[PDB]
Amino acid sequence: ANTSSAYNSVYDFLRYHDRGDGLTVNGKTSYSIDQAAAQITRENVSWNGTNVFGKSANLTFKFLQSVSSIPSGDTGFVKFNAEQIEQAKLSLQSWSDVANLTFTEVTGNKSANITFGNYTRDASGNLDYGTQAYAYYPGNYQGAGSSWYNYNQSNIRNPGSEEYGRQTFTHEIGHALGLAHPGEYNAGEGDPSYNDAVYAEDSYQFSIMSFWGENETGADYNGHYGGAPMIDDIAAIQRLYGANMTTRTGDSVYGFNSNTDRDFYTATDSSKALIFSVWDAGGTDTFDFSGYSNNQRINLNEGSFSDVGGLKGNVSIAHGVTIENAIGGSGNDILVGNSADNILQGGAGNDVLYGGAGADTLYGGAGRDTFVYGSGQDSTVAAYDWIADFQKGIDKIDLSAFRNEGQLSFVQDQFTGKGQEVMLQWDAANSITNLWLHEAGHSSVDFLVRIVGQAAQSDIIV
Ligand SMILES: [Ca+2]
Ligand SMILES: [Ca+2]
Ligand SMILES: [Ca+2]
Ligand SMILES: [Ca+2]
Ligand SMILES: [Ca+2]
Ligand SMILES: [Ca+2]
Ligand SMILES: [Ca+2]
Ligand SMILES: [Zn+2]
């Protein structure tokens, strides 16, 4: 019952931002990903009609060059500029990446499902420099799917350099696809706030359809805005149109050295912030967060949140996604794998690595690292872990988790058969050290961790 601090850091991080069940966060009811998704899609409307789910759609979009009138009554129409067009296309792409949607641009007099246009004045003809943007849900009525933005806002005119502009495009397109705010609130109507949120997870950390900052739920993006669908947004849009299983089906790398060709999944250098919820449909994938010096916490479990590059709760993995590998930076990181076979690289700094179930390959990197094992199922003989760069007298292998079944006894070269004993065996021929653990209740030796290098008894934490 007396686990080490290394074990505890993993145990707690695994429960970072727990949600659903009968939990109460910030004095509010906590929603699971699916409950949040249902709430966001409560209008039960999409381009396929009402109460239609898991149905794909082929949609058209258009950059209006002129208008007969804006459905809201606003005036002073202004067409989209070149930068707005490029950014809007990227926002559209971030939605079609995760849901079974196709977007085709149309021009001229052709009608379109989703339209884009700017406004600058109100119905009275007075300049409006206060509002931001709005959009209309799918439907057969005049203006359905149309989105409008205030050209008097610099973030709207320069969405490529002012992050909130791109986020706004993604947000409004969300409405044009059938998504609603996580709560019954609208701009201008009263002075709504996070206090009015129906559930705890109503923030930018979980949905860009929210109006509330990520700080409301404990996350911190240091003034940045993600610009792409977050975890609950992905579940929501997929509920309506189905998941896109053709996206990034090869071996994908997110973060540094990314091969995604998506700005929000790419970090060009250490001064670049990352804010994203990853959707990936196949292949062996890697979270490369090697360019950071900040202490990071990386979790590869689906639905989980990570603390990357000095930010908090800025990276998450969507439900239905399996990410396999992770690379930390020069800081003192915590790398947590999932049930798949993971390759974890701590990088420089003193790191804590936890492979979890499956046959993992672990690299501590330079520094004083700790490889944690919380269960006999973590490294069975049939699917054993490899610690490929273990440093005798420097690194540590943490087995404190087994204390719950009785303190482990270290034996030199033979098992007594009693149980709860650990042994290290050196093979001079291949320079491999086999770490064997005979667990209580096991009639045979079923736990093994193979080490490429030497290891001392004092390197094993029992
Ligand atoms: Ca992939
Ligand atoms: Ca994968
Ligand atoms: Ca590190
Ligand atoms: Ca694993
Ligand atoms: Ca290290
Ligand atoms: Ca090391
Ligand atoms: Ca493992
Ligand atoms: Zn909105």
Swiss-Prot record:
Q: What is its EC number?
A: 3.4.24.40
Where along the chain is Ca(2+) 7 bound?
365, 367, 369, 395
The record's section on SUPFAM superfamilies has: beta-Roll (SSF51120), Metalloproteases ('zincins'), catalytic domain (SSF55486)
Could you say which residues bind Ca(2+) 2 here?
Answer: 283, 285, 322, 324
Extract the Pfam families matched here.
Answer: HemolysinCabind, Peptidase_M10, Peptidase_M10_C
Q: Its GO biological process terms?
A: proteolysis
GO CC terms for this protein? extracellular matrix; extracellular space
Q: Where does Ca(2+) 3 bind?
A: 329, 331, 333, 346, 348, 351
Which positions in this protein are listed as binding Ca(2+) 5? 347, 349, 351, 364, 366, 369
Q: Where does Zn(2+) bind?
A: 171, 175, 211
The GO terms this record gives for MF are: calcium ion binding; metalloendopeptidase activity; zinc ion binding
UniProt binding sites for Ca(2+) 4: 338, 340, 342, 355, 360
Q: What is known of its domains?
A: The Gly-rich repeats may be important in the extracellular secretion of this metalloprotease.
What is this protein's record name?
A: Serralysin C
The organism that produces this protein has a lineage beginning with: Bacteria, Pseudomonadati, Pseudomonadota, Gammaproteobacteria, Enterobacterales
What gene is it encoded by? Answer: prtC
